[PDB]
Amino acid sequence: KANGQVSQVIGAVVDVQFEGELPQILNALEVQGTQHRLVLEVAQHLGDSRVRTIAMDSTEGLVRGQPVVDTGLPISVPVGPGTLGRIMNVIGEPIDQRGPIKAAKLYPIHRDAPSFTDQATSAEILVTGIKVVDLLAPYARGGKIGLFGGAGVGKTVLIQELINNVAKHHGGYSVFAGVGERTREGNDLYHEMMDSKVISVKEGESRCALIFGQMNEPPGARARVGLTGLTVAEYFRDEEGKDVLLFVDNIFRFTQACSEVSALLGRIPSAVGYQPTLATDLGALQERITTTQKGSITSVQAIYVPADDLTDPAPATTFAHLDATTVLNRGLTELGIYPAVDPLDSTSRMLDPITIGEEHYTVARGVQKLLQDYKSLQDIIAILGVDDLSEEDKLVVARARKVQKFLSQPFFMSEVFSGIPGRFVNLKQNIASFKALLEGAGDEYPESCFYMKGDLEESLAAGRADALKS
Amino acid sequence: KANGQVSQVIGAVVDVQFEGELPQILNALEVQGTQHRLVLEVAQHLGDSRVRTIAMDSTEGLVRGQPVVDTGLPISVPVGPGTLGRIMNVIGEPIDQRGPIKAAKLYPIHRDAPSFTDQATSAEILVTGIKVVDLLAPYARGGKIGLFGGAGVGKTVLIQELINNVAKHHGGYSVFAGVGERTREGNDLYHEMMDSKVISVKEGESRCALIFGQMNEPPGARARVGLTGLTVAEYFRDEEGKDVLLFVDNIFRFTQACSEVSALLGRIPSAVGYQPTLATDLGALQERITTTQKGSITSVQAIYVPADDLTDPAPATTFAHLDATTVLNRGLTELGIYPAVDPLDSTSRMLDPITIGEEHYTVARGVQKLLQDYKSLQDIIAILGVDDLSEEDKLVVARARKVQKFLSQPFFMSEVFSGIPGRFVNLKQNIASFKALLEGAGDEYPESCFYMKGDLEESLAAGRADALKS
Amino acid sequence: LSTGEASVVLAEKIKGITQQNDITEYGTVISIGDGIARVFGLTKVQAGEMVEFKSGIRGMALNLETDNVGVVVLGNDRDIKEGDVVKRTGAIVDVPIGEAMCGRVFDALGNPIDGLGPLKTTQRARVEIKAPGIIPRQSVRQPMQTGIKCVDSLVPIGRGQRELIIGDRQTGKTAIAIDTILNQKEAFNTGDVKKQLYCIYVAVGQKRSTIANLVSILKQHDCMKFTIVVCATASDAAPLQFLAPYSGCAIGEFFRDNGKHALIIYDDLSKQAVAYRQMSLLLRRPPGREAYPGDVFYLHSRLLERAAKMNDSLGGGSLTALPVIETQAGDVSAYIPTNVISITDGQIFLETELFYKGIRPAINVGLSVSRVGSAAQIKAMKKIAGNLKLTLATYRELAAFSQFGSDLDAKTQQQLNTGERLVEMLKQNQYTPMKVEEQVCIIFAGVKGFLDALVTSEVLKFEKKFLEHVRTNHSALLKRIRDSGDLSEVDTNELNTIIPLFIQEGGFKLKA
Amino acid sequence: EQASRMNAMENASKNAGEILSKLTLDYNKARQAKITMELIEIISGASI
Amino acid sequence: QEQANLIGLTAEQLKSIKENDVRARKEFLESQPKLDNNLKNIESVKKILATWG
Amino acid sequence: ADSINNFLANEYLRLQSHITSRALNILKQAQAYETMNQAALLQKLIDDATSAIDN
Ligand SMILES: Nc1ncnc2c1ncn2[C@@H]1O[C@H](COP(=O)(O)OP(=O)(O)OP(=O)(O)O)[C@@H](O)[C@H]1O
Ligand SMILES: Nc1ncnc2c1ncn2[C@@H]1O[C@H](COP(=O)(O)OP(=O)(O)O)[C@@H](O)[C@H]1O
Ligand SMILES: Nc1ncnc2c1ncn2[C@@H]1O[C@H](COP(=O)(O)OP(=O)(O)O)[C@@H](O)[C@H]1O
Numbered sequence A, B: 001k002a003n004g005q006v007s008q009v010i011g012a013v014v015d016v017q018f019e020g021e022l023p024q025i026l027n028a029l030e031v032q033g034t035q036h037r038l039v040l041e042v043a044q045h046l047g048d049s050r051v052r053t054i055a056m057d058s059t060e061g062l063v064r065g066q067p068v069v070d071t072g073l074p075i076s077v078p079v080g081p082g083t084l085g086r087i088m089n090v091i092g093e094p095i096d097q098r099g100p101i102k103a104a105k106l107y108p109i110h111r112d113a114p115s116f117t118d119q120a121t122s123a124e125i126l127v128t129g130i131k132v133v134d135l136l137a138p139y140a141r142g143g144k145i146g147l148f149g150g151a152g153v154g155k156t157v158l159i160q161e162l163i164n165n166v167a168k169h170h171g172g173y174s175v176f177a178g179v180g181e182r183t184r185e186g187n188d189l190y191h192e193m194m195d196s197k198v199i200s201v202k203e204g205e206s207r208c209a210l211i212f213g214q215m216n217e218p219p220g221a222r223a224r225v226g227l228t229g230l231t232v233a234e235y236f237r238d239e240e241g242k243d244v245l246l247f248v249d250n251i252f253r254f255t256q257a258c259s260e261v262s263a264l265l266g267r268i269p270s271a272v273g274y275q276p277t278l279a280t281d282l283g284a285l286q287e288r289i290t291t292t293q294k295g296s297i298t299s300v301q302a303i304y305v306p307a308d309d310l311t312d313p314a315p316a317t318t319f320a321h322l323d324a325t326t327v328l329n330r331g332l333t334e335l336g337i338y339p340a341v342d343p344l345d346s347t348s349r350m351l352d353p354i355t356i357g358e359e360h361y362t363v364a365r366g367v368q369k370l371l372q373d374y375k376s377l378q379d380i381i382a383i384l385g386v387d388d389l390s391e392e393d394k395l396v397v398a399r400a401r402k403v404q405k406f407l408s409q410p411f412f413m414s415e416v417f418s419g420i421p422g423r424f425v426n427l428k429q430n431i432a433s434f435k436a437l438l439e440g441a442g443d444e445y446p447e448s449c450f451y452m453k454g455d456l457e458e459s460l461a462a463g464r465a466d467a468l469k470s
Numbered sequence C: 001l002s003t004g005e006a007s008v009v010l011a012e013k014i015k016g017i018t019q020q021n022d023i024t025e026y027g028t029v030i031s032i033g034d035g036i037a038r039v040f041g042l043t044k045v046q047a048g049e050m051v052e053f054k055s056g057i058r059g060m061a062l063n064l065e066t067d068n069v070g071v072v073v074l075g076n077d078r079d080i081k082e083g084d085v086v087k088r089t090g091a092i093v094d095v096p097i098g099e100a101m102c103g104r105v106f107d108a109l110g111n112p113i114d115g116l117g118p119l120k121t122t123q124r125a126r127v128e129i130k131a132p133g134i135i136p137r138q139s140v141r142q143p144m145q146t147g148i149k150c151v152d153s154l155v156p157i158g159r160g161q162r163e164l165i166i167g168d169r170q171t172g173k174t175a176i177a178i179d180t181i182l183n184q185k186e187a188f189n190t191g192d193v194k195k196q197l198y199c200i201y202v203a204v205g206q207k208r209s210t211i212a213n214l215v216s217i218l219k220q221h222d223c224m225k226f227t228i229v230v231c232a233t234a235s236d237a238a239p240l241q242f243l244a245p246y247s248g249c250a251i252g253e254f255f256r257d258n259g260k261h262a263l264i265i266y267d268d269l270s271k272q273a274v275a276y277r278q279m280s281l282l283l284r285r286p287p288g289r290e291a292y293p294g295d296v297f298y299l300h301s302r303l304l305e306r307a308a309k310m311n312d313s314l315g316g317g318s319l320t321a322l323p324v325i326e327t328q329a330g331d332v333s334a335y336i337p338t339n340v341i342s343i344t345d346g347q348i349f350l351e352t353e354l355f356y357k358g359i360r361p362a363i364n365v366g367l368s369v370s371r372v373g374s375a376a377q378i379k380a381m382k383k384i385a386g387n388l389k390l391t392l393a394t395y396r397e398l399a400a401f402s403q404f405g406s407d408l409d410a411k412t413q414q415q416l417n418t419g420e421r422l423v424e425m426l427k428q429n430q431y432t433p434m435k436v437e438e439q440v441c442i443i444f445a446g447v448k449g450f451l452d453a454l455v456t457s458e459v460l461k462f463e464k465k466f467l468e469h470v471r472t473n474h475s476a477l478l479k480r481i482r483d484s485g486d487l488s489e490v491d492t493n494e495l496n497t498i499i500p501l502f503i504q505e506g507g508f509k510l511k512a
Numbered sequence D: 001e002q003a004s005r006m007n008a009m010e011n012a013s014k015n016a017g018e019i020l021s022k023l024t025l026d027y028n029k030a031r032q033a034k035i036t037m038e039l040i041e042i043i044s045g046a047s048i
Numbered sequence E: 001q002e003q004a005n006l007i008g009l010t011a012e013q014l015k016s017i018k019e020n021d022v023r024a025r026k027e028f029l030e031s032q033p034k035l036d037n038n039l040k041n042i043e044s045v046k047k048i049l050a051t052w053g
Numbered sequence F: 001a002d003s004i005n006n007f008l009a010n011e012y013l014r015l016q017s018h019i020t021s022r023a024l025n026i027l028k029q030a031q032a033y034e035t036m037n038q039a040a041l042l043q044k045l046i047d048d049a050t051s052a053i054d055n
């Protein structure tokens, strides 16, 4: 019927003038007479039959007064086994050139979070194979995980490792959502997924869904692409009931995207320019990613730290919603330690004496206390060497270096970068490895033999060989 | 007959719509139909017969169009001996539940400061009983006194001691204006003055007035309740040539309260968010608190230093108006010394060799130089220690520590915390005690006895007692 | 009461149900966005008055302008549309209060989210009410046992004060609150109404999964029977997060005015400031420093100032507040933390370094302080608490010389070791509250220096073994310390004699 | 002893200067961010 | 009739009460003393503990 | 002799406290169920009223 008419176009925000029967908020509107159909979500009713909406695609080419049709429903994206192995757009359009997606029903990307009555704990550890992770901040399936890191610190490489170790062996479906990232990784990930046989064109395979909101998309798209992929995950959680691995690339872009459009929507800037609805908008997206009685969703979410400022409102508020935390430090990367995980900043709710074995708890605190004490002395160690340091303190410093170097290990996905084969460390080997190291097993060997090693026994073989050659 | 009417209500700011004969600025308006007496102070004339006012009580319950009556005069509060020994509200209401207040007449809280020709300034030592104060920062009777302190440094307890030591045995009256502080302290002080007989129910007694603008009051009231207490002191000053003791609690709340509404009033925020009229608003209050031909006022006002940042605009401007300054340091509290009076930062306009005796001035600087030298040695002592110092420096550090610890004095208000009964130190014994230490009279005895002592003789007696004990 | 008599009263009550409806003014919404609704007309509306939309969701009229009215949507604002009807109820925001609140979980508005059944309550109090005056208050002279050794000994909390749990993320801020609720359960079982303390937990901007885990722990320990949980999650609108603190506070005033004792625990208030900031910014109000409104200080002050100790004339009730504050990088110089510290009486600083060095609860005694001081502690505690502070003070000083080394005087070695015993003594696990009388015994053995004999690694386990040994054999001793509340000389001699004796009895590492 | 001590103080004073200079850069960087933050607050309040 | 109608204690409802009484007994009797563990290894004491009941 | 004489004495009180506590718990526990049965009966009455409205 085209009851709406474009009133004004300002960047990604477009207003539409209707004669009557205004659409509800969050409803999807389609502009007519423009290739590459544009979808507009209702956000505010400015009055006088004027509604302000956000644009998902480039607004270049729009003309004031152009008609607009009211669908009467929010953006509905296809969900079901058809999305498996298929790449979707922020508005549910397939961008993989694979044909139309076969979905039983179209669910709206806007939905309320699960109630308080429908909530499950699911306190079960998730062995990822990374000793530094399983030791300090062990991930638990069905809980929320957060990866904090700056520009070029190893967030993507870490995600690829988890996918190789967890997603492949996983039984239930999976969902990958990219928000404001380089499209090259999306292409490499898709082809890499096909080569690994994780996904195939044959029907009945590819127990994993792919969603991409790469930077090429304009504002508004990177802010709602997560809801699209999240809706695909909620379907498997409630309807299918099986476990789901919701891989979410850097999410800071979502919050950033909102800020990029908040100013245009007439909102007053926040402390450092963000939108005032950052907490609520982010909360609605975060409260929906939770395990319930129907199914569990183990979400691995990356958080980009702007300018390495952890005190920024966006990442700071995210900590309160995460169960397991893994903060990546750039200082470690300079030293060559990979994965550059900060053990004193990587917090995890799963770490407690009652949930995990008491031995695992003691070994964890032993390493944290060791590194914590060493960290309290790095200042003086910089001004002057450790020679003048006390004997007991020198032992702490010496053993701290051994543990720090042993934390690093090569990844299978990062095999091309370093050039050495990856390592998969079992949980039992992880605990036993650090247990013997804290006791003073490999203290006699040089700290170099522990660099990029999988198990403690591997470092001893290298350390013993280094002593034999000389 | 009400001429005005409520037109706009947002937060604590309320606008009234008048038909004719608008009220002058600062006038008191009475709203009719409220469960509690609400008073509005005219602040700005916005034109079109509109006036913007600030509410003294909670604005909840108001209604647009509610009639407003014009009193034709600013907020008038009861003055006279009837207020002595009674708690009063910002608008003059008795909140002590002891009945109505009897006043010979009502004076306005807004008035012009006394002229310059009739200033009649005078300097007179005030023996407060505190040795550290009477020595380094002597107070002048009839001059302003500032107690700069952070959050939880001991400035509130120090005020209680000054009242216990100065207010009592005072021929004239005293006024206590507590603005913005917690109400718990108010109830404690009220019960304290009652037990200490400073206030009583029997008429003709209680030579002390109490005013409270505690946190429980909304904005605007905390910014003008201070003026109410001043009007009471001004009455006792002009009408009777009696020395008035004005004990003002933390005043930063006054400037803070103004900033809480400065935004809504239309003012542009300052460098630190304060109102542009900070200097003028503070100047109008400081100029009114001064001695004149009729009477004198010895005002003891505390300045809360948020985050221990003395560079804040509010306290920075206050230094220019104060005669005596008492800056509290948090480091001393960590050492256990009380009162934690910073000897270097604290200054007094009376600290002049011409004003006070030359001997008093000499001993004062002797201590300041001793402490200043000891502070510089802390750097080298940290790395090398006291042993590596020369004999000259060792004696400096030795006497400096004894003098620093000897500054600590237990007062009556600190008995509950420490458990040692308070003590009063005279000016003569104070100067003589420190003068002897500068000459090395106590260099032989340990530095432990020169801690929380009143007089040097008390320290020597305790030293000998410890000897016979072992 | 016979079953027939009760049924008749039940039927008679259902008979006497009145329902009156009067003309209620309504207005149209000029605009709606981000939860803010501009309403046309709807005059003679009171500030903060409750209004109902077409869908059925409520709203609070905050901004009363000559042109329109600024209303905040108290829920999801998807169904709201331009021109919709808005009916004013005629009553300020309120919430249900009573004894039935205990054992349930409600939201900011007060609706139960447990799903068990409707709330059976008849008393409703206004959310925002003027705080008590100066006369109704009373000096705090009753201890509020939290169950933590370091807290109950160094930073005593008396019923009626305000203590601030300040720290960084994952520093044990919530762990302290849980331990307190668990400790009060024992006093609830025993028939001592003078020591029962109703617990109220206000969750503001927290994931429901965490609150779900929180409630399960209370039921596990059976401590939910006397706990009230108010939930204002992140998905909840900012006004809900803004009213939830005051909402739960009104529930506490019930026990306060009724001579009872209630403990309210406000979660991170920084989240409230963001919701309050968001609510203010969307209303087109001029922002202050850090984008927060000008009267943000009045917010927390008005909320915390209500907690007080009512005098005996009103029943002697008391309301204790334990607001929590989350710091970004341990910087307490920020605006919001600085204000809250100046409002509360004492503050508990949590350090991340101490947490990872094994000092859990990671409490920085150097900065923590309480206005009430020893006025709340019991006689048997003040005597031992005083010496404990001095000993710990010296140990922190000698900490540096430990690195210096190369020599150690006989006494310094003792003071260095003695302090190490106390630090190892104050440590406490999670979900393990201790009784007040038990702490007095352990804290006593530490200051006296008996712990200097056994190795430090054996001090923590010695605590458990010692307490168990006392409860079985020395039961009369615990009763006297509990009833009388004082450590008599007879108990000192007996206690002073068994502590050295027990250490020799049990199998420990006596070599210091 | 005196020989090694002198060399140690030289290396220590050297390292002390390098770190002191590094923090100076961060101090200036933080100074610019401080003026930026405060200035935006004033503009935000002046806008309305 | 109200005697039983008001309080209709079912068989299983009273059965649970009876099990608690038995449970209290077994706990009271089977409760053995807790002394030094590795020191009470005498043939006599161990025999008594086995037949504690 | 005095160690066993005092043991049986204090043990006798512990047994007495065990019985009185058992006799009191069984009574209080039974009362708890009795109140639950009464509430369930009355709850059915309220449930019948609500169903009548629906009809
Ligand atoms: N006293 C303690 N003893 C043993 N473990 C503890 C203790 N305190 C915290 N932990 C562990 O720290 C984690 C949770 O910390 P906690 O929630 O208590 O601090 P928090 O400041 O409230 O965190 P957040 O700010 O994110 O809500 C858990 O892994 C817990 O096991
Ligand atoms: N496990 C690793 N081991 C060794 N080097 C690595 C490892 N991970 C990353 N590097 C290097 O770190 C760089 C940045 O990693 P990346 O995940 O791409 O950061 P970003 O989050 O910005 O995408 C990579 O280009 C890679 O060269
Ligand atoms: N003379 C004193 N000696 C030792 N401790 C003190 C002394 N005075 C106060 N303390 C402590 O200071 C705290 C009170 O600080 P306060 O005076 O109220 O600061 P503020 O003025 O900011 O409110 C109390 O906990 C009290 O135990």
Ligand SMILES: [Mg+2]
Pocket (backbone or CB within 6 Å): A154, A155, A156, A157
């Ligand atoms: Mg990356």
Ligand SMILES: [Mg+2]
Pocket (backbone or CB within 6 Å): B155, B156, B181, B250
């Ligand atoms: Mg104070």
Ligand SMILES: [Mg+2]
Pocket (backbone or CB within 6 Å): C173, C174, C175
């Ligand atoms: Mg917490």
